[PDB]
Amino acid sequence: DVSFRLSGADPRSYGMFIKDLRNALPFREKVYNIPLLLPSVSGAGRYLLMHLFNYDGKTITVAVDVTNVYIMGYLADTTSYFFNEPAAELASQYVFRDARRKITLPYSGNYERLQIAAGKPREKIPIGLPALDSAISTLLHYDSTAAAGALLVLIQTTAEAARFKYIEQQIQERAYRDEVPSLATISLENSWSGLSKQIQLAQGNNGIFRTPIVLVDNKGNRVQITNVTSKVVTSNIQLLLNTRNI
Ligand SMILES: Nc1ncnc2c1ncn2[C@@H]1O[C@@H]2COP(=O)(O)O[C@H]2[C@H]1O
Numbered sequence: 580d581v582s583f584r585l586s587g588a589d590p591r592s593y594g595m596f597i598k599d600l601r602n603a604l605p606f607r608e609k610v611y612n613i614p615l616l617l618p619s620v621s622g623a624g625r626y627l628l629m630h631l632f633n634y635d636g637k638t639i640t641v642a643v644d645v646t647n648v649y650i651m652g653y654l655a656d657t658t659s660y661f662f663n664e665p666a667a668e669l670a671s672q673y674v675f676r677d678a679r680r681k682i683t684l685p686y687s688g689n690y691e692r693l694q695i696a697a698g699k700p701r702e703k704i705p706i707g708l709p710a711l712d713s714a715i716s717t718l719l720h721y722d723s724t725a726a727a728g729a730l731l732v733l734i735q736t737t738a739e740a741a742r743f744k745y746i747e748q749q750i751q752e753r754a755y756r757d758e759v760p761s762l763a764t765i766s767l768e769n770s771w772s773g774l775s776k777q778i779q780l781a782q783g784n785n786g787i788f789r790t791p792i793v794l795v796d797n798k799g800n801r802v803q804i805t806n807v808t809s810k811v812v813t814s815n816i817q818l819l820l821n822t823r824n825i
Pocket residue numbers: 648649650651662664667687688689690691734738768769770771772
């Protein structure tokens with residue numbers, strides 16, 4: 580398992596949590612020095628448990644699929660909650676079995692579906708460590724509209740920070756003050772599957788992307804990624820989605 584406590588949290592302790600989260604995801608190889616997530620994991624081993632504590636020390640446990648860093652569902656006290664999608668229904672056979680009741684949320688975990696349920700797109704929802712405190716508090720007691728927003732904060736401050744060093748550093752900048760995600764943050768979230776695919780294809784194409792990827796850089800400017808010498812490949816991306824799952 581991995582844990583993060585908002586009480587006494589600082590940029591350093593958040594960084595240690597994101598390092599713990601990356602290190603809990605299995606890999607058999609690295610592609611251009613980036614861990615390659617597994618094509619498949621059978622049984623309960625597919626799911627990592629993340630224990631998150633708000634400023635007041637109240638806790639949820641979040642189940643994460645270790646093949647793709649997707650959040651499946653979470654446990655709050657004696658109630659489990661799962662996304663309305665087949666991967667999450669399967670997860671509910673293995674995690675949080677001892678919950679008194681299991682609620683299926685009225686949405687999948689897709690960003691587009693969560694944004695419709697929340698009533699706002701990601702670009703308008705402030706993120707940061709205070710926002711994550713609020714999200715844990717929201718998820719402790721069922722409210723499906725509030726939960727959608729809280730889940731968009733939770734996904735970006737955990738899974739997306741695990742995937743990209745830049746996003747980890749953006750949340751560190753928001754340790755004591757929330758701010759809507761940067762243009763580069765949204766670009767990277769949207770591009771993870773595409774970048775993962777092109778980096779794996781670059782093995783066999785001399786490090787050259789078969790299809791260049793258009794991103795937004797840390798200054799808000801267009802950058803076209805053509806090959807593995809790009810900063811996004813050498814420094815930023817931390818995990819690759821296996822091409823078998825694309
Ligand atoms: N259970 C989930 N199902 C689908 N997407 C999820 C889930 N949990 C978190 N996400 C995020 O929603 C996003 C939608 O497709 P993405 O390529 O952007 O990557 C995904 C994940 O980062």
